[PDB]
Amino acid sequence: VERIKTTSSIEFARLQFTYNHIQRHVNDMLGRVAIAWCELQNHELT
Amino acid sequence: ENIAPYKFKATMYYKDVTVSQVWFGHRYSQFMGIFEDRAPVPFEEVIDKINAKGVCRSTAKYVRNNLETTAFHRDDHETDMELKPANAATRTSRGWHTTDLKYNPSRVEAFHRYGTTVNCIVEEVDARSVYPYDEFVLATGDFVYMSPFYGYREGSHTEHTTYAADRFKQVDGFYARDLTAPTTRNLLTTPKFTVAWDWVPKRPSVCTMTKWQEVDEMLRSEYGGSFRFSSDAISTTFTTNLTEYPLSRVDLGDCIGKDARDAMDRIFARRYNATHIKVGQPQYYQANGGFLIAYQPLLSNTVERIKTTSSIEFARLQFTYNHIQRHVNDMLGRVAIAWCELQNHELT
Amino acid sequence: ENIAPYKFKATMYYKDVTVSQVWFGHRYSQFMGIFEDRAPVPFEEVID
Amino acid sequence: HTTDLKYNPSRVEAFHRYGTTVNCIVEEVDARSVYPYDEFVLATGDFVY
Amino acid sequence: FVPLEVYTRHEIKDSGLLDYTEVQRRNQLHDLRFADIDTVIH
Amino acid sequence: FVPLEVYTRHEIKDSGLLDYTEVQRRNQLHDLRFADIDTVIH
């Protein structure tokens, strides 16, 4: 058995949430931009 | 939300009474009991003697355990002692005492002998009170069970006192000669001392709000049915309801108007002397977490109590996320529009 | 992690004993010691 | 409480005189304990081990 | 973002097992509550 | 970003109405200030 110590600051968790949200969205949009750029080049080869 | 107490200055007058009983052996002496007590200094003794002539009466009459008791400084006659400065020490306020050698009985044979000792003492003490300012405290640790603002004038007798009517007395036009302008003094005699402090009206003296920050420029915008007040001076975005917050609802909130108007005037003079003009009266809104925002709009030339959260990281996080969201959304909108135009353009 | 203590209600029974010794002068009176104490109230005194 | 006037001896001459006073008191008090709940405290400041 | 605290400062104040303010506020109300501080006897 | 605190820990310490440290530091300086602790009498 043991006892659990809780940190008095939650700002690590909220910071993690904010950064995760921004990272996920920016990564998604940039992936779409990269894929579109790739398709545009493969498309203008003609 | 102000949490620091209301602080002021007070003066305690009391007489340390010290009775000591001694036994006298055939080669030694031995205490067999030291009764100590803090008698209060009566009213006319504060007025006619301490404040006027800087002397104390070297005798103590007081009611203890429902009895009238009298102490004489050496069991001798009553005199007037020359109140004098006390020893010095670090981080202590000015004090004054009339004796520094506890009198003890002269040596006799096996008989026990009793020795009294009355030491008149006057100290200056910080005093503190907390909402609803029903009673206040001294740095000595003693208490006083009456509001700091109780008084005869201005209906102050509405305020809370716990002691009887006689124990409290208000003096008008008091002049305070130090013991080295007219004032009104509250004088109270609790069963341990006599506390004195300068009476002042309540509403202009306290406030349940504290000026926390001054922002030269905070942008207000409307969004989703609420106001965003965002500042880059502190990187913080508060959110408030669209309607204002009437100050009449704020308990004891009489300093808010004065402080806000003073700060806006000073900041307007310092920065917006001529480039901008005020628009309407100052407004008041309440933000998430309990922060009360006083907002004075600008233009270019061309009852209850409020609880405030102890962490502002929600607001700074909101500001950071809002800034990033706005910028990324703007840039991605531009990219999407450019991509659209490029396709419509290469159709040719 | 809970940090607020465990709070409950209790009842204290005790007798303030106050012995006072007085001296009686020819025109006045003077305390010369006030012993005070908090004696406990025994069990059957609480119950009965 | 059962009394509110501390009894004091009647006036006599120079003799010291002794006066007792017993005041029975019953109060309701909040009590608090902290882990591992080995002892607890009353709002009066007294302890119970 | 909504405000969020692991421990509100009221809790942090309360986690103290005893409190000098409260103890002194209760132990000097003793005379008023459990005795008469005014009735002088002769 | 500049440092920003709603309540500096000095204020949080100060919001306490009384203080055991300060009270004890003042109530034991009593003998030194208002009496002589050395002069023995015979």
Side-chain angles (χ1 to χ4, degrees), chain B residues 57-71:
Chain B
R57 267 194 154 282
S58 161
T59 190
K61 283 183 65 66
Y62 64 100
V63 56
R64 178 67 77 224
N65 275 213
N66 294 30
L67 184 148
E68 175 174 359
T69 186
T70 312

PDB file of all heavy atoms in Angstrom, chain B residues 57-71:
ATOM      1  N   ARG B  57      -0.455  56.930  36.332  1.00  0.00           N
ATOM      2  CA  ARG B  57      -0.914  57.163  37.693  1.00  0.00           C
ATOM      3  C   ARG B  57      -0.326  56.220  38.735  1.00  0.00           C
ATOM      4  O   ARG B  57      -0.697  56.327  39.907  1.00  0.00           O
ATOM      5  CB  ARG B  57      -2.436  57.084  37.753  1.00  0.00           C
ATOM      6  CG  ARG B  57      -3.110  58.421  37.582  1.00  0.00           C
ATOM      7  CD  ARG B  57      -4.567  58.361  37.980  1.00  0.00           C
ATOM      8  NE  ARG B  57      -5.060  59.661  38.414  1.00  0.00           N
ATOM      9  CZ  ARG B  57      -4.818  60.187  39.608  1.00  0.00           C
ATOM     10  NH1 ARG B  57      -4.086  59.522  40.489  1.00  0.00           N
ATOM     11  NH2 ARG B  57      -5.305  61.379  39.920  1.00  0.00           N
ATOM     12  N   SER B  58       0.554  55.296  38.355  1.00  0.00           N
ATOM     13  CA  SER B  58       1.270  54.451  39.316  1.00  0.00           C
ATOM     14  C   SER B  58       0.338  53.711  40.263  1.00  0.00           C
ATOM     15  O   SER B  58       0.742  53.338  41.365  1.00  0.00           O
ATOM     16  CB  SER B  58       2.271  55.261  40.135  1.00  0.00           C
ATOM     17  OG  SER B  58       2.625  54.553  41.307  1.00  0.00           O
ATOM     18  N   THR B  59      -0.913  53.513  39.865  1.00  0.00           N
ATOM     19  CA  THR B  59      -1.849  52.708  40.631  1.00  0.00           C
ATOM     20  C   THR B  59      -2.898  52.182  39.667  1.00  0.00           C
ATOM     21  O   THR B  59      -3.201  52.815  38.655  1.00  0.00           O
ATOM     22  CB  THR B  59      -2.493  53.502  41.771  1.00  0.00           C
ATOM     23  OG1 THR B  59      -3.223  52.612  42.620  1.00  0.00           O
ATOM     24  CG2 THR B  59      -3.440  54.540  41.230  1.00  0.00           C
ATOM     25  N   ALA B  60      -3.430  51.006  39.968  1.00  0.00           N
ATOM     26  CA  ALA B  60      -4.313  50.316  39.037  1.00  0.00           C
ATOM     27  C   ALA B  60      -5.593  49.917  39.743  1.00  0.00           C
ATOM     28  O   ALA B  60      -5.563  49.110  40.675  1.00  0.00           O
ATOM     29  CB  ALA B  60      -3.626  49.087  38.444  1.00  0.00           C
ATOM     30  N   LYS B  61      -6.710  50.477  39.297  1.00  0.00           N
ATOM     31  CA  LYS B  61      -8.029  50.092  39.770  1.00  0.00           C
ATOM     32  C   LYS B  61      -8.749  49.390  38.636  1.00  0.00           C
ATOM     33  O   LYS B  61      -8.898  49.956  37.551  1.00  0.00           O
ATOM     34  CB  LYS B  61      -8.837  51.306  40.223  1.00  0.00           C
ATOM     35  CG  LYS B  61      -8.443  51.841  41.578  1.00  0.00           C
ATOM     36  CD  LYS B  61      -9.343  52.988  41.982  1.00  0.00           C
ATOM     37  CE  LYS B  61     -10.770  52.513  42.165  1.00  0.00           C
ATOM     38  NZ  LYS B  61     -10.886  51.568  43.307  1.00  0.00           N
ATOM     39  N   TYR B  62      -9.191  48.164  38.883  1.00  0.00           N
ATOM     40  CA  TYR B  62      -9.806  47.425  37.795  1.00  0.00           C
ATOM     41  C   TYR B  62     -10.679  46.321  38.360  1.00  0.00           C
ATOM     42  O   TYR B  62     -10.483  45.869  39.486  1.00  0.00           O
ATOM     43  CB  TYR B  62      -8.734  46.874  36.852  1.00  0.00           C
ATOM     44  CG  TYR B  62      -7.805  45.854  37.468  1.00  0.00           C
ATOM     45  CD1 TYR B  62      -7.983  44.499  37.254  1.00  0.00           C
ATOM     46  CD2 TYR B  62      -6.687  46.253  38.174  1.00  0.00           C
ATOM     47  CE1 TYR B  62      -7.111  43.573  37.786  1.00  0.00           C
ATOM     48  CE2 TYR B  62      -5.819  45.335  38.713  1.00  0.00           C
ATOM     49  CZ  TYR B  62      -6.032  44.001  38.514  1.00  0.00           C
ATOM     50  OH  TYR B  62      -5.157  43.097  39.054  1.00  0.00           O
ATOM     51  N   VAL B  63     -11.651  45.902  37.566  1.00  0.00           N
ATOM     52  CA  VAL B  63     -12.560  44.836  37.954  1.00  0.00           C
ATOM     53  C   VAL B  63     -12.057  43.544  37.325  1.00  0.00           C
ATOM     54  O   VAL B  63     -11.981  43.411  36.098  1.00  0.00           O
ATOM     55  CB  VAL B  63     -14.006  45.151  37.558  1.00  0.00           C
ATOM     56  CG1 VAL B  63     -14.122  45.441  36.075  1.00  0.00           C
ATOM     57  CG2 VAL B  63     -14.894  43.998  37.936  1.00  0.00           C
ATOM     58  N   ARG B  64     -11.684  42.605  38.176  1.00  0.00           N
ATOM     59  CA  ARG B  64     -11.247  41.282  37.771  1.00  0.00           C
ATOM     60  C   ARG B  64     -12.040  40.256  38.556  1.00  0.00           C
ATOM     61  O   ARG B  64     -12.290  40.443  39.749  1.00  0.00           O
ATOM     62  CB  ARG B  64      -9.755  41.091  38.016  1.00  0.00           C
ATOM     63  CG  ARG B  64      -9.248  39.714  37.665  1.00  0.00           C
ATOM     64  CD  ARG B  64      -9.314  39.470  36.177  1.00  0.00           C
ATOM     65  NE  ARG B  64      -8.238  40.158  35.479  1.00  0.00           N
ATOM     66  CZ  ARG B  64      -8.403  40.846  34.358  1.00  0.00           C
ATOM     67  NH1 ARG B  64      -9.600  40.937  33.805  1.00  0.00           N
ATOM     68  NH2 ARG B  64      -7.370  41.440  33.791  1.00  0.00           N
ATOM     69  N   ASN B  65     -12.443  39.186  37.881  1.00  0.00           N
ATOM     70  CA  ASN B  65     -13.284  38.151  38.472  1.00  0.00           C
ATOM     71  C   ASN B  65     -14.405  38.766  39.292  1.00  0.00           C
ATOM     72  O   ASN B  65     -14.661  38.388  40.437  1.00  0.00           O
ATOM     73  CB  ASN B  65     -12.460  37.191  39.313  1.00  0.00           C
ATOM     74  CG  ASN B  65     -11.856  36.088  38.494  1.00  0.00           C
ATOM     75  OD1 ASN B  65     -11.691  34.967  38.968  1.00  0.00           O
ATOM     76  ND2 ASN B  65     -11.510  36.400  37.256  1.00  0.00           N
ATOM     77  N   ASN B  66     -15.063  39.748  38.693  1.00  0.00           N
ATOM     78  CA  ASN B  66     -16.236  40.371  39.284  1.00  0.00           C
ATOM     79  C   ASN B  66     -15.905  40.995  40.631  1.00  0.00           C
ATOM     80  O   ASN B  66     -16.660  40.873  41.592  1.00  0.00           O
ATOM     81  CB  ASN B  66     -17.363  39.357  39.416  1.00  0.00           C
ATOM     82  CG  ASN B  66     -17.864  38.899  38.079  1.00  0.00           C
ATOM     83  OD1 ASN B  66     -17.112  38.862  37.108  1.00  0.00           O
ATOM     84  ND2 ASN B  66     -19.134  38.543  38.012  1.00  0.00           N
ATOM     85  N   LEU B  67     -14.758  41.660  40.706  1.00  0.00           N
ATOM     86  CA  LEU B  67     -14.345  42.303  41.941  1.00  0.00           C
ATOM     87  C   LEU B  67     -13.527  43.537  41.609  1.00  0.00           C
ATOM     88  O   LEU B  67     -12.840  43.584  40.588  1.00  0.00           O
ATOM     89  CB  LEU B  67     -13.550  41.333  42.817  1.00  0.00           C
ATOM     90  CG  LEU B  67     -13.096  41.784  44.197  1.00  0.00           C
ATOM     91  CD1 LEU B  67     -13.077  40.607  45.121  1.00  0.00           C
ATOM     92  CD2 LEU B  67     -11.708  42.342  44.096  1.00  0.00           C
ATOM     93  N   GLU B  68     -13.606  44.539  42.479  1.00  0.00           N
ATOM     94  CA  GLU B  68     -12.852  45.775  42.325  1.00  0.00           C
ATOM     95  C   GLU B  68     -11.536  45.657  43.081  1.00  0.00           C
ATOM     96  O   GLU B  68     -11.535  45.505  44.305  1.00  0.00           O
ATOM     97  CB  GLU B  68     -13.651  46.968  42.839  1.00  0.00           C
ATOM     98  CG  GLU B  68     -12.880  48.265  42.815  1.00  0.00           C
ATOM     99  CD  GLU B  68     -13.735  49.454  43.188  1.00  0.00           C
ATOM    100  OE1 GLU B  68     -14.941  49.263  43.450  1.00  0.00           O
ATOM    101  OE2 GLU B  68     -13.202  50.582  43.223  1.00  0.00           O
ATOM    102  N   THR B  69     -10.423  45.749  42.360  1.00  0.00           N
ATOM    103  CA  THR B  69      -9.107  45.521  42.933  1.00  0.00           C
ATOM    104  C   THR B  69      -8.175  46.680  42.616  1.00  0.00           C
ATOM    105  O   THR B  69      -8.220  47.268  41.529  1.00  0.00           O
ATOM    106  CB  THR B  69      -8.510  44.210  42.429  1.00  0.00           C
ATOM    107  OG1 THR B  69      -7.279  43.952  43.109  1.00  0.00           O
ATOM    108  CG2 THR B  69      -8.270  44.262  40.947  1.00  0.00           C
ATOM    109  N   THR B  70      -7.325  46.997  43.590  1.00  0.00           N
ATOM    110  CA  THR B  70      -6.452  48.160  43.549  1.00  0.00           C
ATOM    111  C   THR B  70      -5.022  47.724  43.811  1.00  0.00           C
ATOM    112  O   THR B  70      -4.762  46.997  44.773  1.00  0.00           O
ATOM    113  CB  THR B  70      -6.875  49.190  44.591  1.00  0.00           C
ATOM    114  OG1 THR B  70      -8.287  49.403  44.500  1.00  0.00           O
ATOM    115  CG2 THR B  70      -6.160  50.497  44.363  1.00  0.00           C
ATOM    116  N   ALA B  71      -4.100  48.175  42.967  1.00  0.00           N
ATOM    117  CA  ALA B  71      -2.690  47.825  43.077  1.00  0.00           C
ATOM    118  C   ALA B  71      -1.846  49.088  43.138  1.00  0.00           C
ATOM    119  O   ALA B  71      -2.035  49.999  42.327  1.00  0.00           O
ATOM    120  CB  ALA B  71      -2.253  46.957  41.900  1.00  0.00           C
TER     121      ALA B  71
END
